[PDB]
């Protein structure tokens, strides 16, 4: 869909690094790749997620940012757990 | 927060293969050609260095099954977050 783990990762990196350009540096992509992801999410959910000026998240943007970090942690834990089992097989 | 091989879409492919019983029927459900589902599965195997399906009917490996089952928990939480975000947007009378 447009809510992807990558979109949540983009949102997390923009919050942490402060801007599209700094977040794109972290993720190793060109900035337009990050804005494209965010445009598709904003258009699907039909809401503004943040305003750049550092970056300020909207109320809906902050809920996706904060609850999305819980999902990212769970995805990393699942990845870790599956690889650990795989080494035993 | 940066293990990027696993996607929710790959988990949804996994769920459809389990529910429908074959790559062919799952691909039919998802509106894709069956080899597109094979590619998504095999690219994840290669990125994670795991094997998801038994190589001796379509059967998940023990590793594939842990991703399938615990991945459904992730899918439910992603749907819940989508619903909650949409509900907040409505109470705020979001712009279209
Ligand atoms: Cl947070």
Numbering used by the authors:
A (entry chain B): 5 to 57, 60 to 95
B (entry chain A): 2 to 57, 60 to 99
Paste lines from the article.
Two conserved domains in LTTRs, the N-terminal DNA binding domain (DBD) and the C-terminal effector binding domain (EBD) are connected by a single linker helix (LH). The YhaJ transcription factor responds to dinitrophenol (DNT) and its metabolic products.
The crystal structure of YhaJ-DBD was determined at 1.76 Å resolution and refined to R-work and R-free values of 17.3 and 21.8%, respectively. The asymmetric unit contained a dimer of YhaJ-DBD’s. Three α-helices (α1 [Leu9-Arg21], α2 [Phe24-Gly32], and α3 [Pro35-Asp50]) constitute the DNA binding region, followed by a winged region (WR) (Val51-Thr64) and a long linker helix (LH) (α4 [Asn65-Arg93]). In the dimer, two charged residues Arg73 and Asp87 in one LH interact with Asp87 and Arg73 of the other LH, respectively, stabilizing an anti-parallel orientation of LH’s. In the YhaJ-DBD:DNA complex model, YhaJ-DBD interacts with the major groove of the target DNA. Positive residues (Arg33, Lys44, Arg56, and Arg60) of YhaJ-DBD interact with negative-charged phosphate groups in nucleotides.
